[PDB]
Each structure stands twice: as C-alpha cells, then as structure tokens.
Design a binder for this molecule. Structure first.
Ligand SMILES: CCCCCCCCCCOCO
Ligand SMILES: [Hg+2]
Ligand SMILES: [Hg+2]
Ligand SMILES: [Hg+2]
Length: 185
C-alpha cells in the first residue's frame, strides 16, 4: 500500500545519506596524526632511535602536534632531530612540551580530495533519485488497476518529492562542511 511505499522510500534514502556521511568522514583534511613523526631519528645517548620510542605525540589540533618527551633531558635533542629531518617542520619548544605546527595539505592534494567528495556526493544524489523514481513507479503504476486515484497520486508524488528534497539537502550540507573543512587550513 501507499502507507508502506513512502516510508519504504525514506528508509532507503536515509541509508544513502548515511552511507555518504560515513564514506566521507574517512577523508582526512589536515596532516595531523599521532604517528606522523614516529620515523624521525633522534640521537639518544649515542644510538639513533625513532622518536616514537622517546615520546608521546598527541594531536593538539588539526594542524598542530604536541610532543611529550618522557625524559626531559632529551627534549633539546628531540627538537634538533625535528629540525634535522628537513621536513620543513619548525618545532616550537616551550615548557616541558614541544609543539609542531604542520604545513597544509598540498594544493594538488586538496583538489584530489575535493574531487573525491564531489563524486561521492554525486553518487549519493543519483542513488536518492533512483529511490524517488522507484517510489513514483509503484504509485503511478498502482493507479492503473488498483485503488488509488489522481488526488492521492498527486499528494503521494509530492510527499515523495519532498522526501527527496530533504535527502538531497542533507547530502549537500555534508558536502559543504567537508569542502569548508578541506578549504579550512
Ligand atoms: C610524515 C611526516 C610528514 C611531514 C610532512 C611535511 C609536509 C611535506 C609535504 C611534502 O611536499 C613535498 O616535499
Ligand atoms: Hg550512497
Ligand atoms: Hg625520552
Ligand atoms: Hg624511552
């Protein structure tokens, strides 16, 4: 019946938007990660050792790392090791903690990612319009032989169109926030 069909359509459209929302949250928009500097070699009592074994690296923010050295006497050496890796990283030392601001993703990268979210959004929009269509079908078709008539078709078609509108609207909002994120730093 028509009671089923439309509630069936929005459950379908919801799944689409939600798949898009999860597919997109995977995309990182900044360089920040707790293991980003794990590979930096530090002079530790003669022996070169990866930074990972000498300090805790926490993500203070999307483009900044906070390095927590376990042995305070090693901080100076860690700071030199960071400058020395020649990654363009300007370590900012201050009070038992070293902070590491990070360069933004490259122009080329942002474009590769903008392109990916747009394609996924696009996919989400086609999926949503296919569900709309499948609904319209049942409705318009049921009009042929079984019980529904023009004014129930109209309303039903319009109620469905609006479901499509709200579903398309969520995808657009998820997309915009993501590009705003990408374009952020
Ligand atoms: C894993 C540690 C990464 C540090 C990244 C600094 C930014 C490098 C950008 C690369 O551009 C080409 O040289
Ligand atoms: Hg989808
Ligand atoms: Hg240490
Ligand atoms: Hg250690």
């Amino acid at each position: 019946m028509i009671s089923d069909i439309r509630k069936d359509a929005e459950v379908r459209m919801d799944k689409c938007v939600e798949a898009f929302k999860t597919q997109i949250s995977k995309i990182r928009t900044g360089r920040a990660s707790p293991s980003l500097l794990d590979g930096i070699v530090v002079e530790y009592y003669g022996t070169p050792t990866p930074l990972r074994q000498l300090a805790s690296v926490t993500v203070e923010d999307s483009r900044t790392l906070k390095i927590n050295v376990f042995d305070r006497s090693m901080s100076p050496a860690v700071e030199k090791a960071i400058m020395a890796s020649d990654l363009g990283l300007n370590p900012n030392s201050a009070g038992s903690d070293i902070r590491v601001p990070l360069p933004p993703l490259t122009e080329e990268r942002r474009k590769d990612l903008t392109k990916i979210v747009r394609g996924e959004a696009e996919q989400a929009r086609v999926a949503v319009r296919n569900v709309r269509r499948d609904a319209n079908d049942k409705v318009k078709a049921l009009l042929k032989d079984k019980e529904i008539s023009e004014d129930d078709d109209r309303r039903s078609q319009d109620d469905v169109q609006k479901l499509t509108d709200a579903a398309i609207k969520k995808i657009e909002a998820a997309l915009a926030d993501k590009e705003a994120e990408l374009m952020q730093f």
